[PDB]
Amino acid sequence: MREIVHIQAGQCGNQIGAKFWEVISDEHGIDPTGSYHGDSDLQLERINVYYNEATGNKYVPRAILVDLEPGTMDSVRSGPFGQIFRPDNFVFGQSGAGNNWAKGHYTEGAELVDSVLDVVRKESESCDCLQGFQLTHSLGGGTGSGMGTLLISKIREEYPDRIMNTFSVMPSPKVSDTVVEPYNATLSVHQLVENTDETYCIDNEALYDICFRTLKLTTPTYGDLNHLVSATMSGVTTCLRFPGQLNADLRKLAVNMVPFPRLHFFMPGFAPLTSQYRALTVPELTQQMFDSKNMMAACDPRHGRYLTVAAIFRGRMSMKEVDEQMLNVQNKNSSYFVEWIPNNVKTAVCDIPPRGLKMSATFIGNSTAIQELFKRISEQFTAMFRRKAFLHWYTGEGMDEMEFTEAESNMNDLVSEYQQYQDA
């Protein structure tokens, strides 16, 4: 188990996805045309996880770029690292999906899905040992939401034993393109509860607040939100992309993070938050990454309890001080970690720091406080659905009101299930 297949779907999926390849290619010393110009052998030791090797010693990302319109995928190709991607892996339709889950999942996206799966099969075939898939998308649009979850369902049919993880951007009125986002997200969440092993719940509410409150940016663009996303995505993928004596693949990580199959929605976090000169001390990283302000999903961890925690520190620091600090927050806030999973906070350290920072920490939290996120989308859903508002857009594409009722019920069951373990 070494190779991971990456897929990016829709405007948002391709935007944050393109930043992921901008960040990690710099970390692996791969230039905009695909040639290696690093210095450490550690940059090439596990380069196979995300790159295929081409003729002339070129490194081509194992990345499939999906959208139902050309727009954003034309921007990706024109953008700074656009030339590195394999041209066959740009699979796109023309009419778009108009922020419509039904168009992505059932009509427009159905017409395109089989040609995307052919490229996935192409990449999966020439993989010595495929460990799984990762997907970037939003749940608020049409393509990433509707087609992304369709692809996830088709990939599970063809590759039932491989890991499926997602980086799933959640919608919020604060950063809102259309009023139907709660509908699109609720329909997607039900798909993710069934068909993913992990979903990283990037909340655009939280990314905005981090940009506004704790980074003093008055008018945040999507680039400012995506900067925080790409830093986190680098962090969660670090332990696969480098050593250091950590013998773990996606399954091993998923086995230790997910005690219950449906409860695999994580709370990502990063320290320090950037947009510096004084490098942070190990106590500061530990306090910041556990701080609510640094959470990428707009939930208060004090309102829930941690099932599992994973923290991966980057940079040259004392592992003794890391162990001391990670044991300090557990033993001084022991009510917020479930007693019925002993030793649930685990830690790794990687020597290579990311670009610009001398040391950093990435936080992955399977907290029951994530119910707050699903409750917030459930309220926005019901507000519209009690009056069947905007439903004509979905019923015109052949959907039934029953499918909405089901999805509503399934997400409120997920919230009930998170509540069960919060009190136990």
Ligand X SMILES: Nc1nc2c(ncn2[C@@H]2O[C@H](COP(=O)(O)OP(=O)(O)O)[C@@H](O)[C@H]2O)c(=O)[nH]1
Ligand Y SMILES: CC(C)(C)c1[nH]cnc1/C=c1\[nH]c(=O)/c(=C/c2ccccc2)[nH]c1=O
Q: Which two tokens stand for residue 287?
A: 């306090």
Stretch that binds ligand X, among 25-33, 141-149, 254-262, 311-319 (CB under 6 A): 141-149
When asked if residue 257 is in the footprint of ligand Y (CB under 6 A), the reply is yes
CB 81 within 8 A of CB 18: yes
Using the rule CB under 5 A, is 11 a contact of Mg ion? yes
Q: Which is nearer to ligand X, 173 or 244 (CB)?
A: 173
Residue 204 interacts with Mg ion (CB under 5 A)? no
**197 contact choice in ligand X, Mg ion, ligand Y, none (CB below 5 to 8 Å, kind-dependent):** none
Query: Was 281 annotated as part of a binding site?
Result: no
Q: Check whether 129 is labelled as a binding-site residue.
A: no
Please state the φ and ψ torsions of residue 29, each to the nearest 5 degrees.
70, 30
Omega within 30 of 0 (cis) for the link into 71: no
317 binds ligand Y (CB under 6 A): no
Told to check if 63 binds ligand Y by CB under 6 A, we report no
Figure out which of the listed residues 80, 244, 283, 396 binds another protein, where binding follows CB under 8 A: 396
Q: Which of 53, 57, 48 is nearest to 86 (CA)?
A: 53
50/101 with CB nearer ligand Y:
50
Q: Does 253 bind ligand X (CB under 6 A)?
A: no
x/- site string to ligand X, residues 72 to 91, per CB under 6 A?
Answer: --------------------
C-alpha closest to that of 103 among 169, 168, 183: 183
Instruction: Write each residue from 157 to 196 as x if it is in contact with ligand Y (CB under 6 A), else as -, in one continuous string.
Output: --------x-------------------------------
Q: Does 405 sit near another protein (CB under 8 A)?
A: no
181 is known to lie in a ligand binding site: yes
**Is 390 among the residues that bind ligand X (CB under 6 A)?**
no
Which C-beta is closer to ligand Y: that of 63 or that of 254? 254
Q: 167 near 200, Cβ under 8 Å? A: yes
Residue 400 interacts, among ligand X, Mg ion, ligand Y, none and using kind-specific CB cut-offs from 5 to 8 Å, with none
Known binding residues for GTP are 11-12, 98-99, 138, 142-144, 181, 204, 222, 226
Known binding residues for Ca(2+) are 111
Known binding residues are 11-12, 98-99, 111, 138, 142-144, 175, 177, 181, 204, 222, 226
Residues near ligand Y (CB under 6 A) are: 134, 165, 198, 236-237, 239-240, 246, 248, 253-254, 256-257, 310, 312, 346-348, 364
Residues near another protein (CB under 8 A) are: 106-107, 396-398
